[PDB]
């Protein structure tokens, strides 16, 4: 590996084809370094545009994109340093047990145009195979009876459900 020794031990035909082996050998190792290094920069140009979207939309806001901050209803995202990068911790609520219930866009007293109708306020109308309707939050079955300041008094709409009764809400 010494360039003086190679040229002071051989003739100038052999000491110039064996100095073209150290040099051509070392030029390849250095060139393969530079190609693999530029291959990593060109990959991280676009990985940075993905990291900046997860900071602005998962960590510093509440996002409306399905599956972007992990699967499920997004509660919280926090972020930590890792060796040579960043690690995101995503916390989400996924469903566990289910239940089949009846549901409707809203309720009307009679099937004539001009009857009093209700829809639910901030949730859904459910029944669970009962003779009377109930209120639940829209992503969890947790039923409540119907009340003033729990429903909204509206006009009709496309296909509300008729009770042929009057509402118990005074």
């Amino acid at each position: 590996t010494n360039f003086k020794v190679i040229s002071q031990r051989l003739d100038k035909l052999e000491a110039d084809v064996q100095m073209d082996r150290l040099i051509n050998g070392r030029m390849n190792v250095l060139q393969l370094f530079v190609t693999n290094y530029k291959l990593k920069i060109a990959e991280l140009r676009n990985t940075h545009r993905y990291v900046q979207s997860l900071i602005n939309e998962c960590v510093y806001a509440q996002s409306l994109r399905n599956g972007f901050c992990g699967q499920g209803l997004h509660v919280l995202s926090l972020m930590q340093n890792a060796p040579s990068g960043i690690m995101f911790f995503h916390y989400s609520l996924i469903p566990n047990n289910t239940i089949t219930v009846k549901t409707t866009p809203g309720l009307c007293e009679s099937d004539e145009l001009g009857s009093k109708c209700i829809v639910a306020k901030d949730g859904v109308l459910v029944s669970a195979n009962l003779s009377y309707w109930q209120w639940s939050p829209r992503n969890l079955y947790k039923p409540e009876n119907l009340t003033f300041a729990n429903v909204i008094a509206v006009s009709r709409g496309a296909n509300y459900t008729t009770l042929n009764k009057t509402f118990d809400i005074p």
Binding site: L44, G70, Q71, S92, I99, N159
Partner: protein
């Protein structure tokens, strides 16, 4: 161990272990005639032009360039391989074993004084030796070979028909390759001995017989390793639908390889019904290597997720609503720096 550079191998799947096969080197693919002899380097009257011989496309024979006495010529002896008619070579490699490109040979004779025989200067592709006509009288005969052509191929022992049905790394007309051969009724152009379909060698022609080249499918295997006395073998490129001594001296059945979509399986259970949810040893194409009780090949499966999209309710119907939720944690790593 020598492939993995370990002494205590942990359980895993270790790929692309290979199998050795013989070697068959063909310099020429057709039989030849016999060579001429040497012209004895003796002249009639006083002195005449020494007779030459052209050696090409023939079979030189053993030690028929010296006198049958086994004392005189022995200065051209090197080792147990000793049939070497050259002394100093220019500039080709001196030892003659196998084939040489078809020289022209001229011989000669001279009186030997001082018991020392001198070297005339050589142009390249001229190599010479010298023997003794008679040693106690000190008269030596010599010969120099002038390789006028490259590729005439004087060769001993005309080549013979190869063995059809065994993997072996051939070398036929400057092209080395590996595979098996079989007899074919396919005929191609007489200009060519080799034939390519695209870029793969498909036919060879040896001694006028055309052999279709096939890839030998048992050259590579994976090991489904569990311990010293329990492992399984998977030959990822072999089709054992129909049709072995390497495996009779490792494990019990000669035959009884299972034909899978992954390859031919040996001494491992194939259970395509059963599924695994955590595959720590994947095989590829949806499969998993179970290496915990014994060796078994099962199917991979994934846990199913849901969506936060809820279709809005426009008429009275049934809906499937959740009763409770599970909090999960998802770690996501992304590389940002070097």
């Amino acid at each position: 161990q020598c492939k993995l550079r370990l002494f205590d191998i942990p359980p895993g799947v270790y790929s692309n272990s290979e199998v050795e096969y013989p070697t068959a080197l063909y310099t020429v693919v057709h039989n030849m005639s016999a060579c001429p002899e040497r012209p004895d380097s003796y002249c009639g009257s006083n002195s005449c032009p020494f007779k030459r011989a052209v050696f090409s496309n023939c079979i030189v024979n053993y030690t028929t360039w010296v006198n049958p006495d086994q004392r005189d010529f022995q200065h051209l002896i090197l080792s147990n391989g000793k049939f070497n008619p050259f002394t100093e070579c220019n500039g080709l490699n001196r030892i003659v074993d196998g084939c040489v490109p078809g020289f022209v040979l001229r011989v000669g004779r001279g009186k030997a004084v001082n018991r020392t025989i001198v070297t005339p200067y050589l142009k390249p592709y001229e190599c010479f030796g010298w023997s003794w006509n008679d040693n106690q009288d000190s008269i030596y005969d010599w010969w120099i070979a002038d390789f006028v052509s490259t590729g005439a191929f004087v060769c001993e022992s005309n080549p013979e028909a190869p063995k059809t049905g065994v993997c072996v790394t051939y070398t036929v007309e400057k092209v080395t390759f590996q595979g098996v051969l079989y007899e074919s009724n396919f005929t191609f152009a007489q200009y060519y001995n080799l034939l390519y379909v695209g870029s793969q060698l498909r036919y060879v022609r040896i001694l006028g017989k055309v052999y279709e080249v096939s890839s030998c499918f048992e050259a590579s295997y994976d090991v489904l390793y569990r311990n010293n006395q329990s492992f399984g073998l998977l030959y990822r490129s072999f089709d054992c639908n129909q049709l072995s001594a390497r495996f009779v001296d490792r494990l019990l059945p000669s035959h009884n390889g299972t034909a899978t979509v992954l390859g031919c399986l040996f001494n491992a259970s194939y259970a395509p019904n059963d599924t695994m949810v955590n595959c720590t040893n994947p095989l590829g194409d949806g499969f998993c290597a179970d290496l915990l009780g014994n060796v078994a090949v099962r199917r991979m499966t994934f846990e199913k997720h849901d969506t936060t999209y809820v279709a809005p309710v426009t008429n009275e119907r049934y809906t499937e609503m959740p009763l409770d939720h599970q909090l999960i944690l998802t770690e996501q790593f992304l590389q940002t720096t070097m």
